[PDB]
Symmetry: D2
Subunit: 460 residues, 4 copies
């Protein structure tokens, strides 16, 4: 009931005090993000709490953070915490651990190079054209646009074609076989009934693992499993599947089911994340028409006459970059980074017992007054070539840092940027009566707007 509940009181580490069995989870009634702020303010720089019986040690010192993410990554802090029954998805690089992770990490790093990415741009860019045509039809008829559905559909189209060559217009084909399953691959709400129970009955995982109950649905994983065995057997492009089929012709060649595992996790990592950030950005651009106009101006300069964006001209645009980064400062959608302490260690004047989840509260550091002037404000300027220098890369970590960081970072920024470019080239975006202002974050376990973002969309 109190297993390890004296561990932090003992070691000298402060923090809220736990309740038996539940630990501190009642504190999650306002969300991971709000609880992390309060803990930063009211306890300082290091603190501890209990996800049920599991102690979690929050750390906020950039040198200490670097040690965990960078320095001792491979020796002490290699893995994230178990979070549910995962079945065969224990082979997805995100879930695999220790050496199996390192092998998967290596077998996949060449798939995410800039070269591989530059050759996917003409595919990603095609569904930007699709986006504008579907945006225009809703811009034609004066009717508010709900960003999450139009950007949701764009993200889906980008994934089907980048990882499977499946060329869909997911919006206009809302009944395709390939759209129904991939749309069931949403991000996990670790504050919803099931995942909370898993936290205070971690011993229920093995019970579930033996009933073959799985947090990745049996049908989705089954449909994609067989749908990929078709694609492999009809090919025998430039998409993730093929680069992976390539890398299996100094570690053990990528297995068959391991390739299926990665394709599904790429979807999981890329679907809701992308559409959610594109919507946050559109909210900020719609509530600061000066930033929007400025970006539209920077776009028309590089791309004269709605010229089509390319890998190289995308990377030209400084102010676009500043909008993307400043939006991810406010809304880092992972909320936290975490690693399991797998040994006893001392790092930066602090002993850490084997088994503690060490956690880095990204949302709260990105909104720390002590590192950010006027943190609540959308201020794209803080990332200009002028100011970009005094930003610590261990305070601002929307993609994490170190060897276990987001292997999809460059792909995701290039995907979102292509979207925002082709959309601002043709449209302007305005607040509504119904446009929730100021926007409220959800109280749940996902960093998303309370109410969806809806906006007026006009044509240029």
């Amino acid at each position: 009931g109190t297993h390890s509940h004296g561990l932090f009181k003992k070691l000298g580490i402060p923090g809220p005090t736990p309740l038996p069995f539940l630990g501190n989870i009642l504190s999650y009634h306002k969300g991971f993000c709000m609880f992390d702020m309060e803990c930063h303010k009211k306890y300082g720089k290091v603190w501890g709490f209990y996800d049920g019986q599991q102690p979690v040690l929050a750390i906020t010192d950039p040198d200490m953070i670097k040690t965990v993410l960078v320095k001792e990554c491979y020796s002490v802090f290699t893995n994230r915490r178990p979070f549910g029954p995962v079945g065969f998805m224990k082979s997805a690089i995100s879930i695999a651990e220790d050496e199996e992770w390192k092998r998967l990490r290596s077998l996949l790093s060449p798939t995410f190079t800039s070269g591989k990415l530059k050759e996917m741009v003409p595919i990603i860019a095609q569904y930007g054209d699709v986006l504008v045509r579907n945006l225009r039809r809703e811009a034609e008829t004066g009717k508010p646009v709900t960003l999450k559905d139009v950007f949701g559909a764009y993200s889906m189209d980008v994934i089907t074609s980048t990882s499977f060559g499946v060329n869909i217009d997911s919006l206009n084909n809302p009944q395709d076989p390939f759209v129904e399953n991939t749309k069931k691959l949403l991000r996990f709400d670790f504050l919803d009934p099931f995942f909370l129970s898993i936290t205070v009955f971690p011993f229920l995982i093995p019970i579930l693992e033996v009933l073959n109950i799985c947090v990745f649905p049996r049908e989705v994983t089954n449909f994609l499993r067989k749908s990929v065995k078709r694609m492999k057997e009809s090919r025998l492009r430039v998409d993730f599947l093929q680069l992976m089929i390539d890398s299996q012709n100094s570690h053990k060649a990528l297995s068959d089911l391991e390739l299926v595992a990665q394709s599904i996790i790429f979807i999981f990592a890329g679907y809701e994340t992308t559409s959610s950030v594109l919507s946050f950005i559109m909210y900020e651009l719609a509530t600061h028409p000066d930033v929007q106009q400025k970006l539209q101006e920077e776009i028309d300069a590089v791309l004269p006459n709605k010229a089509p964006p390319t890998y190289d001209t995308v990377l030209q645009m400084e102010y676009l970059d500043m909008v993307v980064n400043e939006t991810l400062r406010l809304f880092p959608i992972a909320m936290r980074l975490e690693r399991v302490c797998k040994k006893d260690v001392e790092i930066n004047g602090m002993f850490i017992p084997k088994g503690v989840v060490v956690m880095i509260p990204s949302y709260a550091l990105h909104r720390d007054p002590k590192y950010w002037t006027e943190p609540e404000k959308f201020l794209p300027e803080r990332f200009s070539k002028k100011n970009k220098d005094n930003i610590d890369p261990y305070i601002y970590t929307p993609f994490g840092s170190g060897p276990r960081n987001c292997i999809g970072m460059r792909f995701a920024l290039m995907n979102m940027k292509l979207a925002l470019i082709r959309v601002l080239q043709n449209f302007s975006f305005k607040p509504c009566k119904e446009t929730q202002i100021p926007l409220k974050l959800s109280l749940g376990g996902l960093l998303q707007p309370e109410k969806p973002v809806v906006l007026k969309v006009e044509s240029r």
Copy 2:
């Protein structure tokens, strides 16, 4: 490991001998139906086995059967066995038990009278017209027809409109909100991984009931729960919802959530059952064109010039009735009837300990040589007014018998008959090269064809 595994060896009752923990479930590798036959042949008239640790006493004596289903129903054998975590669906009349069942049974019996049914015929009959139009378009283009999809869609249309007034053409609207959830309400395969585990880990039910994992999906039950709260609040027809909303204006008036519970179970009881029998019947009529022609002839006689069937002219047709009943003899899709023994009893020279599932092997009795001449053969004649007399109603029980029998019997026969009438009026049905002949039953826990039934469909 062997809890109660001597109970039948002791009492004197024969039967296969169990394995620890698993009981006799390895015997289910050929299906409930085949295992029940072998047990009838090789052990006689009474026998016992173990679904894991749970003893099941099979009985085949018509007097003994009557005692269980009819005589001592309310005192000893009131309930079916628990079969999964059910959540709020513990209020569906099928799952409720003891007095709560009797109340629900009474609060719903007037909803299934013949009067209420005769006023639903013009609704049911409308989607017969819809069936023929969709059948014709597939009969127009010479392309094999897969019965389960065209009869699947008809069954869905009949349910939406009979229980919610929702008027859909489910086939041509394969993307309606109301079709996606109700199509996820299929019959349970108690021989599939999950339900088998539930059988040898019955103690896993409470674990699941507390994670709110449920065998009726949370979304389906949630969508229908709210979708009904709309219909109640827009009404404030002749459909099940309204007759139920009626019966809540000597027992406790039907509750709100109890009404939601029944509407979903009516779907569960009526969707796959109906479409599966309609397909079995079409198989038999397509593999005996003499029966088919004879029925077409009996239909044209009562209904001159594709005249539209009515409640009364439907009940006119003897040979139609004989085809429906003879098909349900071969294919009684419940396979077994069961009741939990809730007390110790002696019935017909046999003591039965509290807790035994008493079970009646319908599939095997319907195909018993000792009651049926040439049981394997489709012989509609055995049910004519001439021969219908020497059929024991405790050997032939496709809808069960007694107070807990199928409260939807008359509705289901009238629904299927309306379908078969309007379809034979306009079409003839022929075997294919691909038409699996002879048809094989599935090895799983549902009584359905191994491979789907597909047939040539011509026009008259």
Copy 3:
């Protein structure tokens, strides 16, 4: 997590508000007794709380209490709550439920008549002689006496010989086979780690029931099971075993294992209960030498010259009775009486939903100022023939009331009285320096002294 946690807020019933999963069990940090008082004071006459998810409705109205214990006992409130995995001890009359309880209750009522008891007095009385000899040897050498060990040994001797004819001097034979197991049969601490977990993981019971883990130890129950099969087979006295072997030569004759079940529960009900009350009484008599002297005087009057007590002269003694009853007022060692509500009901202007544990806080009513003048004080007089009249038998219930009350009441009072008589005849009892004064009740789940009672024991 909150299953039924709105049930009392809804029905209108007040009470502390629950925490998810745990309900109100954090409130048990001071004990059932103290929590029950606070709830009586601060919420009044009726209230509700949650043992995890299980709602418990406390009631304190004598008419309402009578309804539950007496009036609707057989129809609505027949059983106590499940409390642990019990294995075969589900046949002990205390644990059995509904009709199986009524049968066991009837098959055992004639074993507890006054006639049967009067013939056990010469056995019980013999080990009073044994008590005095062992008390004297500790009274001889001036050394404090720890009541729980000398009365513990007396209680054990009374049980072995009353239920099995086994004639031991448990103290001087602290290594007999028959003493080691029966001494492991102590009362359950429902506030200790295991039983608390059972309360907030009631779903863990079936898991345990299938590993054959049992709250009655496998060895104790096994030793006594075989040790009784010896006694049955060597007999083939006046003791419980024989009266039971008798009653199996209008319900089903007592089974073999059912007889073993009762013998163990008689031990469980009678061992720690008796020794604990004898010690409470000795504390009160030692902290009021006037009561003690008065009782010694009433004993010498009826029993001139340490004359040996008999059934009839035991029942002569009014003041003895008043001391026993007043001690059980302060220390009713069951603390609460409970029944499961098995139907919906209205009783005395109150609706009660099926499934609620209805609970009667005996400890708090016995110490209610509103029924007892100076409740904290040991006042034997309130039970004299003069005052015994205005005591409601539904406020003062140390043995419960109604058909499910203590079937061992008369036996227990006669056993304790014989002890107290033969001991006061020969000894006087005095407070020590170490004698905890005032005595503190344990904070756990058993009503016993914090620290053991130790006292000076002199000879007469």
Copy 4:
């Protein structure tokens, strides 16, 4: 249900075929030992089976065995399989794993040197004198002697005094506090109900670990935990406790609770093991009076006139050694050695997947005709300095081999030898009518006689 059940059929490895859920455990109805022989004969040199879902790869090639036990011990095969909920005893060197094991292994190796052992001989030897006095009193009165009780008591006396300095005559004090708990520390029967369930519900371990249910009893571990905190605090000899208290004044000094953990495991490893081998040896010496006489002769030669054995004269005796070793050949009481495969590997032309329990069937190799002439026969000669050479130390492994072997080997042989010496010096031992001849091994999970060994004991 069949998780990994194709792993051996796939890899090419033969073996009995499994049943769902249970694997091959029905095969354990004759015991680990008999099942291991049949598997050696009927499948050859390598085979696989399933303890439920857990694959176990048996290996019998001395080079392959050496690789696992010696060569790749620290890299691949460091740990034994989890076997039950162990609580804090996860710190006992036997249960600890990976580096924590290596640290414990090092912190304890100097406690088992020959120097430390030679200084414990005068303690061990003292309770040999105690043994002879208690043996004589049973040899005085002509009454069969049950070896397991007289050698059981000797083993207990040797442990209390070697690990805690507690100087008991456990037999004549069968009621000491320190004897009652340590006698509850018997070897685990992994074929008894509980441990078998753990094998096919390994997921039940975490459920138990959270109810603090433990396979080392809470009371035994609690009594010894506090009883050691006394001994530490009264000291602040030459016994295990002190050598351990010593080693905590290049790894982390032995913790407090870690020291308590080791003391209990030393008891667990040493109590039943020793007494069981001493009894096997006495059986063999009593059923071959020529060996016995020969040993008595070799003892009288080194120790003239019942001279007292010393470390050095104990190691003098070749024929004693040959009797001890030949008895452990027949009866290697661990039965199997095992290690978990923690990586994928190829060793001696064989790939082994991560997670397989690799197992070495000691009992069956010790009785392999292909390495042992007349294996069923007790032939002390095979271990003489003449023949001891062609015995492979990877076929004959009564204490295992390699870094994880029995850290108590020398202590155990010296303890048993001192016993056998002082006993044969004074007694001769003869078969009885009741002496089970030939002796049968138990069908359970412990290598012990079916029926106890009883023998005539005469004096010299």
